């Protein structure tokens, strides 16, 4: 009777049915005045009942955590009907190679699994969160990989059938091999800097998925925006409520477009502890203002949803997986993939105010179909989707923008050559040489960007904007930019990118190279 989980065609299947994970990040024990990593462990069942009910009403089918629940907490989640992506508290800053830290991790995990195995609401284990690049270099990647392998095997034995992965951050662990895990996963934030400035959000994360080999399901384990009054820099911190809402919707679309089949927006509610003073809501700490819910004051245990909550609820009712936004098609047949909740009874697709598709939905969840189009030459197309309830009232609009032709056609192409090319030990100074092959009706925007991201903590390293106004009409456009290589840079992501337009369709062309210092990453790095 227990849930059968099957991974195929890069989807999770639950009991034979494709299942799009609509999760939210959720941290119990983090109300004003509380600190979940220092308090004595408490089940907090009354507050969890409140939370799980709100999360069901917000439209989510899953919760994502960073720490083990007790058996009593699992029972409550089980009863709720929600699924669970359970995080294990393996401290990221500890020495993975210390025999005693490994042993203590093995014992704690086995203790959890001993009771957790009897709760089939658990659909994925996350064995660690955001291990830092310098730390791994410091304790050696071999130690990191060995630790991952121990934890994976323990879980495969102790709770059979449950996928295992980790919440690695995409901006700092782009280099990392994930093929030992059952599922590819990343914390993915879009601040439009470094990799997300050159490639865009969609294409950056899409690129990582392609490097990983498109052979397993991909899920996001975090994404979002902080509404702190002050602090941080750029889009990290200091967003308005509206920017938070619009940002979440933008991220949801982009990450589906990158190939994801599971989503864990960040997160349910603010954690005042995250900035140092747990009884104070600090005006200038971004980390304390990521919630979809906010508290009025220190004695408020309930709080209130911010605008993002309602935007996300309304948006999640009918998800478009295919076609993808900013996708390019050389065929008259366009695959259609939707994941609908039970309120969706009709879907319509229009182009230039003409119906091109119309189906009554008999059955909630995943469905697949095909569109026919008839593009003249190359045509940018805004496909306008409409979702209807049982009263035949529209409940969601969403556009998918595609570029299509019956026949294949030439795109403009950007490639880079990087120095040093393979080994950062071979020089103290780097270059990125950029080459852009133009193409007739693909207008470049004067927005060429270059990133040499040296992976020093969260710092994104050097970034350059290069004007190409002088080279507009030329067939090949080139640039050469130089960067000093820090001695303690162990890996660099070198990238460049520029915006292209055909009609109303705007996209980015780009290239990316990941380059190591010496052989430190022979174990941990992607083959």
């Amino acid at each position: 009777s227990k849930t059968k989980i099957e991974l195929k065609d890069n989807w999770y299947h639950l009991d034979g049915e494709k299942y799009f994970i609509k999760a939210i990040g959720y941290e119990i024990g983090a109300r004003p005045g509380q600190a979940p990593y220092e308090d004595e462990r408490k089940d907090e069942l009354e507050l969890m009942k409140f939370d799980l009910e709100n999360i069901k009403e917000g439209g989510y089918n899953t919760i994502r955590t960073w720490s083990q629940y007790s058996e009593n907490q699992l029972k409550l989640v089980q009863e709720s009907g929600l699924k669970l992506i359970m995080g294990i508290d393996i401290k990221p800053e500890e020495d993975y190679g210390d025999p005693e830290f490994v042993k203590d991790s093995e014992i704690e995990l086995k203790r959890v699994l001993n009771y957790a195995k009897k709760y089939d609401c658990i659909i994925t284990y996350l064995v660690i969160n955001e291990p830092q690049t310098d730390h791994i270099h410091s304790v050696t990647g071999k130690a990191f990989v060995d630790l991952m392998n121990t934890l994976i095997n323990i879980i495969h034995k102790g709770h059979p059938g449950i996928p295992v992965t980790l919440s690695a951050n995409a901006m700092i662990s782009d280099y990392m091999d994930e093929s030992i895990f059952d599922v590819y996963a990343y914390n993915c934030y879009d601040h439009n800097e470094g990799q997300t400035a050159t490639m865009g959000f969609k294409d950056y994360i899409k690129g990582l998925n392609e490097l990983n080999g498109l052979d397993k399901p991909f899920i996001t384990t975090e994404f979002g925006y902080s509404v702190s009054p002050e602090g941080g820099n750029g889009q990290y911190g200091s967003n308005t409520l509206k920017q938070q809402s619009d940002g979440l919707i933008s991220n949801y679309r982009d990450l589906i477009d990158a190939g994801a089949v599971g989503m864990c927006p960040f997160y349910y509610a603010d954690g005042w502890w995250k900035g140092g003073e747990k009884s104070d809501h600090s005006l200038n700490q971004p980390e304390e203002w990521f919630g979809f819910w906010g508290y009025s004051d220190l004695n408020d245990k309930y709080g209130t949803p911010r605008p993002v909550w309602f935007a996300m609820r309304d948006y999640m009712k009918g998800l478009i997986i295919s076609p993808k936004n900013k996708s390019i098609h050389t065929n008259t047949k366009i695959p259609l993939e939707l994941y609908n909740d039970k309120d969706v009874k009709k879907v319509v697709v229009k182009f230039r105010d003409k119906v091109i598709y119309s189906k009554n939905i008999t059955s909630e969840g995943y469905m697949a179909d095909e569109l026919t189009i008839d593009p003249v030459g190359i045509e940018d197309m805004e496909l306008a989707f409409e979702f209807y309830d049982s009263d035949n009232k529209i409940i969601k609009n969403e556009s998918i923008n595609i570029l299509a032709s019956k026949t294949a056609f030439e795109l403009p192409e950007l490639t880079i050559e990087v120095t040093p090319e393979k080994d950062l030990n071979e020089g103290k100074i780097a270059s990125i040489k950029t080459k852009i092959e133009t193409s007739e009706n693909f207008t470049l925007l004067d927005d060429l960007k270059i990133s040499y991201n040296t992976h020093l903590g969260w710092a994104i390293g050097s970034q350059a904007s290069v004007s190409i106004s002088d080279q507009l009409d030329k067939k090949i456009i080139t640039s050469e930019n130089f960067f000093n290589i820090p001695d303690n840079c162990w890996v660099v992501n070198a990238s460049a990118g520029i915006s292209v337009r055909y009609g109303k369709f705007t996209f980015k062309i780009h290239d990316q190279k990941i380059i190591y210092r010496g052989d430190w990453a022979k174990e941990v790095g992607r083959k």
Side-chain angles (χ1 to χ4, degrees):
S1 279
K2 96 177 157 200
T3 300
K4 190 184 171 183
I5 304 178
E6 191 180 333
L7 309 181
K8 80 171 297 203
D9 302 315
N10 305 332
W11 279 76
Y12 286 68
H13 298 65
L14 274 51
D15 296 323
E17 304 291 310
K18 290 190 197 299
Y19 187 87
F20 189 101
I21 302 168
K22 295 190 289 170
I24 190 167
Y26 174 55
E27 185 171 62
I28 192 54
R31 259 64 173 179
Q34 302 190 303
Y37 290 94
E38 304 147 44
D39 298 341
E40 168 140 298
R41 78 156 59 131
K42 290 179 167 179
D43 289 337
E44 294 220 59
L45 298 179
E46 280 285 296
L47 289 174
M48 260 183 88
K49 282 179 180 64
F50 171 79
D51 293 340
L52 300 182
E53 289 308 304
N54 295 316
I55 286 168
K56 288 161 66 193
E57 284 174 8
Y60 305 88
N61 61 19
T62 299
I63 51 166
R64 174 284 203 253
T65 71
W66 296 260
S67 283
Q68 300 86 283
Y69 283 154
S70 66
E71 183 164 16
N72 288 337
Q73 291 170 312
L74 283 178
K75 281 171 181 168
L76 184 55
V77 176
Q78 197 69 34
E79 292 164 12
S80 78
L82 290 165
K83 312 301 178 177
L84 171 54
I85 302 174
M86 174 156 283
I88 308 298
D89 191 16
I90 304 298
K91 300 295 167 179
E93 314 85 350
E94 266 280 12
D95 185 355
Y96 312 141
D98 178 6
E100 202 64 51
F101 174 76
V102 172
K103 179 195 156 109
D104 287 350
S105 294
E106 288 172 314
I107 294 167
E108 175 57 2
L109 180 55
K110 285 176 172 178
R111 186 193 64 75
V112 166
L113 290 175
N114 195 44
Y115 62 79
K117 50 198 295 306
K118 311 125 31 183
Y119 299 97
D120 72 1
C121 73
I122 298 168
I123 64 171
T124 287
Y125 286 86
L126 302 175
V127 298
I128 196 166
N129 184 58
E130 289 188 350
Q132 279 287 163
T133 304
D134 187 72
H135 176 73
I136 295 173
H137 176 270
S138 192
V139 304
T140 234
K142 192 188 187 318
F144 170 78
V145 168
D146 289 345
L147 177 71
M148 297 299 102
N149 278 135
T150 299
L151 299 176
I152 295 170
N153 292 337
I154 279 171
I155 292 161
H156 283 348
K157 190 165 84 167
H159 197 171
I162 314 297
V164 186
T165 187
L166 80 175
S167 50
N169 180 290
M171 284 298 285
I172 64 166
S173 299
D174 51 0
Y175 68 87
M176 174 179 298
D177 180 72
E178 281 198 9
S179 48
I180 57 174
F181 303 98
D182 307 308
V183 160
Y184 301 125
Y186 296 111
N187 295 346
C188 307
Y189 290 88
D190 180 8
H191 300 130
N192 186 26
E193 63 182 353
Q195 297 90 303
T196 55
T198 57
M199 279 165 279
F201 195 38
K202 174 196 172 184
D203 282 3
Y204 177 44
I205 302 304
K206 182 177 175 279
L208 293 184
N209 197 35
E210 286 168 6
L211 285 170
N212 289 341
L214 297 175
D215 53 339
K216 312 176 153 142
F218 165 53
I219 67 174
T220 66
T221 48
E222 285 184 18
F223 61 97
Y225 295 99
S226 160
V227 295
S228 64
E230 291 170 49
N233 91 288
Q235 289 183 252
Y236 175 69
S238 298
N239 296 263
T240 62
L241 292 171
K242 180 196 191 343
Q243 293 171 318
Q244 177 189 49
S245 187
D246 294 350
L248 267 292
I249 303 307
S250 179
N251 291 179
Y252 217 103
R253 172 73 275 138
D254 294 350
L255 293 165
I256 291 170
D257 295 323
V261 294
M263 300 287 171
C264 305
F266 189 81
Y267 55 166
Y268 171 54
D270 289 350
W272 290 22
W273 67 273
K274 290 166 83 93
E277 299 292 353
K278 63 186 134 83
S279 300
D280 194 72
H281 204 199
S282 144
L283 299 177
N284 68 1
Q285 294 290 340
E287 288 295 314
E288 292 179 39
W289 300 75
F290 268 96
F292 291 5
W293 291 55
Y295 300 106
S296 53
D297 58 278
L298 174 57
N299 210 41
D300 179 19
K301 293 177 325 199
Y302 300 103
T304 61
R306 293 173 171 143
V308 59
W309 181 258
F310 299 107
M312 283 283 286
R313 183 193 61 193
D314 298 357
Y315 180 85
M316 268 172 72
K317 294 251 161 229
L319 291 176
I320 307 164
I321 284 79
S322 306
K324 294 173 166 53
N325 190 49
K326 303 309 173 60
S327 65
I328 302 171
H329 292 263
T330 61
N331 189 10
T332 58
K333 302 302 172 170
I334 307 309
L336 179 82
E337 292 183 276
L338 302 174
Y339 193 92
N340 298 313
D341 97 1
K342 66 171 184 299
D343 291 348
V344 172
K345 300 300 173 182
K346 190 199 296 182
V347 179
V348 175
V349 183
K350 286 168 177 137
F351 175 69
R352 303 189 179 142
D353 316 283
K354 177 194 183 184
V355 177
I356 63 170
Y357 177 93
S358 198
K359 185 182 159 74
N360 297 128
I361 304 307
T362 58
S363 194
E364 86 175 84
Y366 179 85
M367 58 154 296
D369 210 338
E370 246 181 9
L371 306 169
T372 307
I373 56 167
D374 197 19
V376 178
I378 309 172
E379 262 186 343
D380 51 308
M381 308 191 237
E382 196 185 6
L383 301 175
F385 286 68
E386 297 173 356
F387 299 80
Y388 294 87
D389 66 19
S390 59
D391 298 305
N392 203 36
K393 302 311 192 205
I394 192 166
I395 62 163
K396 174 178 183 185
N397 294 97
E398 187 171 17
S399 286
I400 302 294
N401 294 283
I402 69 167
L403 186 65
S405 176
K406 295 175 312 178
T407 57
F409 57 99
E410 198 202 11
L411 293 175
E413 196 204 12
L414 187 158
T415 60
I416 65 174
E417 289 166 47
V418 183
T419 306
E421 185 196 355
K422 297 186 172 198
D423 188 357
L424 298 187
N425 281 326
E426 87 137 17
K428 278 171 144 34
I429 299 164
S431 78
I432 297 174
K433 276 183 292 171
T434 299
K435 171 181 161 175
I436 302 165
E437 302 193 73
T438 57
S439 197
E440 32 265 285
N441 25 254
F442 289 98
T443 302
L444 303 173
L445 280 37
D446 186 1
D447 79 326
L448 169 62
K449 292 193 199 324
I450 320 284
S451 163
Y452 197 78
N453 185 343
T454 47
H455 283 70
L456 307 177
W458 294 108
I460 57 150
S462 290
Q463 188 168 2
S465 294
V466 179
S467 194
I468 63 162
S469 64
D470 51 348
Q471 298 187 67
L472 288 164
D473 288 343
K474 296 179 64 196
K475 183 64 198 69
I476 308 289
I477 296 175
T478 73
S479 177
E480 183 179 51
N481 298 267
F482 295 99
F483 302 102
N484 281 301
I485 306 173
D487 296 321
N488 63 335
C489 168
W490 316 127
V491 56
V492 61
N493 183 311
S495 69
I498 195 176
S499 296
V500 180
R501 173 187 298 139
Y502 188 100
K504 303 174 188 185
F505 183 92
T506 285
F507 70 109
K508 291 183 85 74
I509 58 175
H510 42 82
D511 199 14
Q512 185 189 78
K513 301 298 176 185
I514 290 171
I515 310 178
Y516 299 97
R517 178 178 303 282
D519 69 356
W520 77 275
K522 69 186 96 69
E523 297 96 12
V524 61
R526 180 194 290 106
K527 285 72 181 165

